[PDB]
Amino acid sequence: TFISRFAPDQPRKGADILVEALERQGVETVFAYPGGASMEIHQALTRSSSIRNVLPRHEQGGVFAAEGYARSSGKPGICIATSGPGATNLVSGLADALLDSVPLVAITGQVPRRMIGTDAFQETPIVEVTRSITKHNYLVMDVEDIPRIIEEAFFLATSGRPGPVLVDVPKDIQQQLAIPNWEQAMRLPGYMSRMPKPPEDSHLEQIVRLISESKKPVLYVGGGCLNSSDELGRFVELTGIPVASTLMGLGSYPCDDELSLHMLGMHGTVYANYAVEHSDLLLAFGVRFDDRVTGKLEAFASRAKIVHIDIDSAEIGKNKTPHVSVCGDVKLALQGMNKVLENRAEELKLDFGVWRNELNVQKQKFPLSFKTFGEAIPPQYAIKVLDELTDGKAIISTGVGQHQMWAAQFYNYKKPRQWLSSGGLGAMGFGLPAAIGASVANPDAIVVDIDGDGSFIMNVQELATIRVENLPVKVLLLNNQHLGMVMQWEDRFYKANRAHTFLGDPAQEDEIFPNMLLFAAACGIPAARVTKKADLREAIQTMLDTPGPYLLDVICPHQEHVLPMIPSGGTFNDVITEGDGR
Amino acid sequence: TFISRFAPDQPRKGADILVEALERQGVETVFAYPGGASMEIHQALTRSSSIRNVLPRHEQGGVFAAEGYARSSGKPGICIATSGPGATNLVSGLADALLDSVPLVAITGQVPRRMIGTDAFQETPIVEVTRSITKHNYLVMDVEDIPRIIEEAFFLATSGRPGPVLVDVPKDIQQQLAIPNWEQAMRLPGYMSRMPKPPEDSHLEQIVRLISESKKPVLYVGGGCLNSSDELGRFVELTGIPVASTLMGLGSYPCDDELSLHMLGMHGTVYANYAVEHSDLLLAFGVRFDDRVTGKLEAFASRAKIVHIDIDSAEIGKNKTPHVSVCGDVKLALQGMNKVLENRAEELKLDFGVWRNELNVQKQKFPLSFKTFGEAIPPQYAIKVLDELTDGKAIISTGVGQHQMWAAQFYNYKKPRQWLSSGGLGAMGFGLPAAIGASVANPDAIVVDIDGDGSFIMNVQELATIRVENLPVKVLLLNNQHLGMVMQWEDRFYKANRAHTFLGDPAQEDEIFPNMLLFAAACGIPAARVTKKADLREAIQTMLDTPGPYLLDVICPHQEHVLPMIPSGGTFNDVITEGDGR
Amino acid sequence: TFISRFAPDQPRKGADILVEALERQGVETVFAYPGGASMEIHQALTRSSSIRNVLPRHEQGGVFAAEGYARSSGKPGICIATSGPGATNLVSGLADALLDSVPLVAITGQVPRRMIGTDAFQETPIVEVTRSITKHNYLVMDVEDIPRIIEEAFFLATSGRPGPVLVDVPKDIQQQLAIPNWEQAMRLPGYMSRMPKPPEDSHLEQIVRLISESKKPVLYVGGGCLNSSDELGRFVELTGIPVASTLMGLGSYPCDDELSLHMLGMHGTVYANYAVEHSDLLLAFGVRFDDRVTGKLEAFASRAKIVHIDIDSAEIGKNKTPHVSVCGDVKLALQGMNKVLENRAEELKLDFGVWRNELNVQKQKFPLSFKTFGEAIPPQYAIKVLDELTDGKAIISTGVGQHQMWAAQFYNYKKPRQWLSSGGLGAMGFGLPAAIGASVANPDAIVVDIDGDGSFIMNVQELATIRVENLPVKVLLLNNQHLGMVMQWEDRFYKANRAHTFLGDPAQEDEIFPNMLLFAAACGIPAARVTKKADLREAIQTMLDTPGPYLLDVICPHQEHVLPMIPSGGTFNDVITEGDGR
Ligand SMILES: Cc1cc2nc3c(=O)[nH]c(=O)nc-3n(C[C@H](O)[C@H](O)[C@H](O)COP(=O)(O)OP(=O)(O)OC[C@H]3O[C@@H](n4cnc5c(N)ncnc54)[C@H](O)[C@@H]3O)c2cc1C
Ligand SMILES: Cc1cc2nc3c(=O)[nH]c(=O)nc-3n(C[C@H](O)[C@H](O)[C@H](O)COP(=O)(O)OP(=O)(O)OC[C@H]3O[C@@H](n4cnc5c(N)ncnc54)[C@H](O)[C@@H]3O)c2cc1C
Ligand SMILES: Cc1cc2nc3c(=O)[nH]c(=O)nc-3n(C[C@H](O)[C@H](O)[C@H](O)COP(=O)(O)OP(=O)(O)OC[C@H]3O[C@@H](n4cnc5c(N)ncnc54)[C@H](O)[C@@H]3O)c2cc1C
């Protein structure tokens, strides 16, 4: 099948073996930034005709690009860096991918083996450093192990609970000649013998039974359902159970559906939290009962039976004790439960209409709401216009903060892998680079990065990348001259005492600083600004119509606040529904 | 002495205690970027009237700024970040400070103690991660320990071999009220009982004896002499021994002195290496026999007695076996040896004139040299003009690569802490932020950042910082559209096969991309470009005269090569003296 | 309440503070072996009038004695050793206590703080070494922390899932004078915030419901019920559900009860395993689904709903996925379920008589059985006679191997903490020392150690301890000249090819070697031997009647085999029911 590039008996550099290992893995895109310790790999990289490299302007831009790629496709993301500083500049991405469970494979060059542990030029114990922030990592000590390690890395990165895997390759190993054996068996006896088995009809039977015995059932869908979109959908029409989602599960189930309670959590809708607060059957599929969702654990879903299906055993019972658990692939769990539901149809007569109304009233008395002031642009409205003009078919990349929450609240995702946002670690400067990856992974798609002026600038250097790689990335910048989310907290908990949260120039407090348009100009990317709500729709429309890259600097009043809001460690009775820094 | 801000019996937040601990340490400048987990500290920070905060646009800019501060002053550098992503974004700086032995103290907020180890929002085992890349680190588990930990951190960071120390402070510890005890004794029994003692007249006597018995003595000065400038100077006029320096020791001894052999190493002058290759007495003061200096160890200084004085015992004998070692402060070693030299003056009759000539001939037959082509600007010449126009009294910040080597070769440092450059780890994107720190630490000084287009862009966001903080930073950008140092290696070892080393836009190969001037414009920083050598002096002169920030985009032909050059792991007989990518 | 021994304002050595901390913890017995690094503690120990020390002849005898103490009482066990070799000689005990979840506190002296990490005399990184084999450990760095660390150690050792905690105390800290503060609050925010909450009536309600809905229910009781003897008993008479127990749960429920299916597992009764193989409701209380119990996981209890109640969340779902879990104290779970069972009595009408008969038939067709040959002594019979003569009220200590399995099969424990045997790690040489601890903890009890000639000799030096401490320990030695359990495996899987399993003297293959009676003689402990089954009852009777220590060397044919037997990783269909090495 795989047509190689070297004679079956022809020796090649380890570098060449590693690249072929990537080709053999199906990799066709990598984000690598050249450095002395990784030159060989880059050279070997040019000899490949199937793998293309998107050279970023910073290694952090490399990983985030790799995450965007992974998140927007389902394929693993591949980033490559050199030794020392190259490697250290990946840390945030690795930690981010681990926290959000994103399939990733990072390759870093390392000093020659004999030089390791001598404070050699450009060296750092990257395996030591990254051990706690990666799913697993390796330090190649012989060119013979390359094929096996690369296969184990991709296997581990994409199986079970997806996650990052780093492979450290010494320079001398890169230059060493050898005849690769593409048959070696992986050495993963423990991991593999612990891989969940398909769900038993036994357990699934108990769930379908718990459902029929409930009056107030609620689905609590998370990131773990991103691949069971159909299965999940079907399950919903067979049970008619309201669907509340996490920030990571957005898209698994359409937001524009009447059964959709939308997002729950600290900034979830009042009705989604209500539904969970008063439920009697919590179907937690693909979630990890995070604190930004439970608040006070003892008070979370305290009135119902909890069914928790997760691919990671270490997650079942970590914070909430289920009354029914199922360790395994939620996609298969749904597939099985749908069967049972289709057969015992009539004998079940599932009807939760009364529950849905008790809910649809809350959805009515407390819908997501924003306020418009004069001709100022409401960020929510901006996002809403973007939704409308793109017909909600756009891939949305995001920074971290208020804009991130509004980009989640006011856009309606039809499918999963349309929403790329750093949730667990919440890393700033994620949007622009992530957009880059999503675009390369989806050439014919609309890719809009909804950023904040704070986040946007951290990895603004990637604008050079977007231009040179000629990627149609659109940047919907919601500029509010501040570090919004931190600012909102100062207002509500520190009597609005600003502590280094203003990003503009104090010398000219009324001038928009910096002038993001000029950053775009420097990288030859057409840009425009809008201040009046009136001419916002056309602005967004222009951005979309103009071929290629485009930056739309949208100005918003900073006193805006994300709502509703359940303070950290709170209860549904603590939800804040109104007020702003105004 | 220290007038507090809280009643001796008045409880305050841990946050307030930590800041007072910083004031009590003499800290008057910190570089902190606000985040949820560190809000309290930032609030406590606003209540301080002695400590000023320089808010960067990226946490990596925060640390590098802290390094620049430290390096340009001698004081420790203080950077503060939030939990999770804030913390991870410091890794490169910490690793950099450890490798170059820079006094640093980093404070990171952390999630509440009870939340630690639960995959909480924005958390990462920063102490675990940073253990191998820091001199030492802590995880505060009680507000009572703050005073002690902060004192131990500064003590450890600045004593012995300077280095980075990270202190992890949980959010709940920050908000906890207490009465600080500023008397607690440090718990450093092992460390302190191992702190080198002043040099014995015994050993020093043997060195002064070895000197008188030598014919070809050579001083190999390194970063460890940055505080013994005078002592070193005196020692030289009492012995008349030629001074070769490392990239980290530049400035310890004036480059514009006839006894100065300048820098040795991979890119050292042909005469400095010659002097060491043929010496019979190597006086290695404050060096760590790095590979970019020794190349092939068995061949390095293989013809002479090696005297190695280092403050770190783990360094003496790590690569080269001394024939005489002295574990202790080189400043004191010099002080003592100078005494012995002044007394036994006449009876010694130290004269190495013949050696100096055998050398001064090499210095003549092989001086540092560059070539001029038409009206193109030679980067070396540019730097030389900068030297002239600033009278070599400027503080020079640097990126990593060719420009870094030329900025080292063609500038004459009169004193130490005038040359701030990442040597051990060699981190890119170090120059702009480092310049920021050096400037804040030296308000009335000329601070020029000699950058490369590759490095400059990684942390270009710090231009916003420079403007808002109104710092007179000058950026002498040597734009060559490539990743120079990597490019030079492709030329000499890969038949000039470019592998992702071009930073411009392939669509318009002749247009300078990006347009660095517009980046400057976005942040309101006056900028200009020069392409003709003719009008270079005026350009540089303008940059200097124009009050405040200034960016001078200097265009250079990329086929330039740094010379001479001893390939990695080579010998003096392998030194390359000519050729370029032309 | 606690009357101290030092003035509230009187400084004392750390050593004195540590002992008072032990007195304040209720400790009245410790097993310590003096060494240079721990002298101070031993001195401080003599000044205590409440704590008595049982000096062993080996530190391994110290820990095992501490385990026996703990296991036979419920109180934590306290052993103390010196630095270096003293400490290392505890490793096996610590690992043993961790594996079996035994409350233990070990204190080791350490070299002075300043000497740590210098290869000092008698030092070893005991905290580093023991980190993975202890529940938690400490390294005291200041005399001020002694009170707090000791309190945290006992708290952690006895709470949640009991386990070993080691405290490393530097010599200088021991001699340092201070005024102890017995009020300091423990620093266990994470641990404490994660301590299970009492069971909710919700879950308990579901269990009681699952019971009424089952036809073939089976209780799978383990070590975790050792403190819920009554609760468990009551639960059984309210549901009439058969009770199968693990090797660690023996005694929780009386073996001499008709509802008792006895022990299950690799060497469990054929009927206990049958009951589990064909059950429809597995009530796993206080067990950890060990492999010596499940064999092939997919085949274990594969026909029923699994309810698993455990105090350790990390155990629920580790090997078998429950259909109902309850993280919390099984004692409280039982208490709650018994209430529900008493009220809904009539409406439940729980009757499992048919199940019990389907079982009582197996119990009849396949009872535990042994064979008698001529006048040779059957080890099983010996143990049975011991049971009879002691009326099953004796505390039984054990070695590891065949004798251990027979001591478990042929003795009927009425209550928990009557059976002290190393199960998880299965350490040899555990019996004699454990007996010592059980005896000191139960002065007026019959304490018989059923040992094997292999195990008995490893810590035979403790016979000196038994005599000097004048403890009424009886040693029922089942001498078979071999390493039985290993021997049985050679017979069934290696064609009886003996590989170093014979403990006698090959020169006189028929002579019993060694002569255990003479070991007893050396320590002045009356002893006797029996070879004829006929005069066995009187022999055992004598041992019991003779005041004080006594060793009865019982000779048995070695070709005996433990039965039944399900080979490692097997199924109930693989159970071996007959055959011996004969
Ligand atoms: C400023 C800010 C505010 C936030 N506010 C909110 C908020 O209000 N609400 C909110 O929801 N979040 C919020 N978050 C995000 C939050 O931090 C968590 O990232 C999010 O709650 C995690 O949701 P999750 O557990 O569903 O997804 P993940 O964290 O992706 O976890 C998925 C889980 O599914 C399991 N799983 C994976 N694949 C499969 C499979 N095939 N079959 C079965 N199981 C599988 C995993 O192993 C894991 O346990 C916020 C973050 C930031 C930065
Ligand atoms: C592109 C690139 C090229 C390079 N090329 C060269 C080159 O050609 N030549 C070159 O020199 N370097 C070069 N380097 C830098 C190089 O990596 C090393 O950083 C440098 O050689 C280290 O020199 P050092 O040992 O003198 O200083 P340091 O690394 O700072 O080490 C100082 C030493 O002094 C000891 N010491 C500290 N304080 C005291 C005191 N008070 N008393 C006594 N002892 C003390 C320390 O503990 C330590 O062992 C290059 C780096 C890069 C990025
Ligand atoms: C030669 C040899 C042969 C063996 N053969 C067998 C055999 O055939 N059958 C057999 O059973 N064993 C056998 N073993 C013993 C075996 O290795 C395991 O030690 C035993 O199966 C463990 O049983 P357990 O899980 O019930 O107890 P433990 O290992 O003590 O585990 C108890 C569990 O209960 C939990 N728990 C503790 N306290 C509480 C509380 N208050 N409330 C709720 N939960 C709590 C714990 O945290 C833990 O998960 C053998 C060992 C040896 C040396």
Ligand SMILES: COC(=O)c1ccccc1S(=O)(=O)NC(=O)N(C)c1nc(C)nc(OC)n1
């Ligand atoms: C990146 O550094 C190393 O990996 C390295 C580290 C210590 C000893 C020998 C080497 S090496 O000989 O094997 N390679 C090397 O020095 N390289 C690959 C390198 N590349 C570039 C682009 N510049 C410089 O040095 C100034 N070195």
Ligand SMILES: COC(=O)c1ccccc1S(=O)(=O)NC(=O)N(C)c1nc(C)nc(OC)n1
């Ligand atoms: C940064 O996060 C934490 O440190 C934290 C992590 C897990 C549980 C509880 C907390 S916390 O309650 O103590 N604090 C918190 O959630 N903060 C301080 C916070 N700050 C900001 C600016 N935004 C958000 O959340 C969206 N949280």
Ligand SMILES: COC(=O)c1ccccc1S(=O)(=O)NC(=O)N(C)c1nc(C)nc(OC)n1
């Ligand atoms: C056990 O050793 C140590 O703990 C120790 C180790 C290194 C340096 C200094 C000491 S020490 O000075 O503080 N103590 C010491 O040497 N002791 C307490 C000791 N005790 C005995 C019974 N014999 C010997 O030494 C032969 N030393």
Ligand SMILES: [Mg+2]
């Ligand atoms: Mg903003």
Ligand SMILES: [Mg+2]
């Ligand atoms: Mg360049």
Ligand SMILES: [Mg+2]
């Ligand atoms: Mg035996």
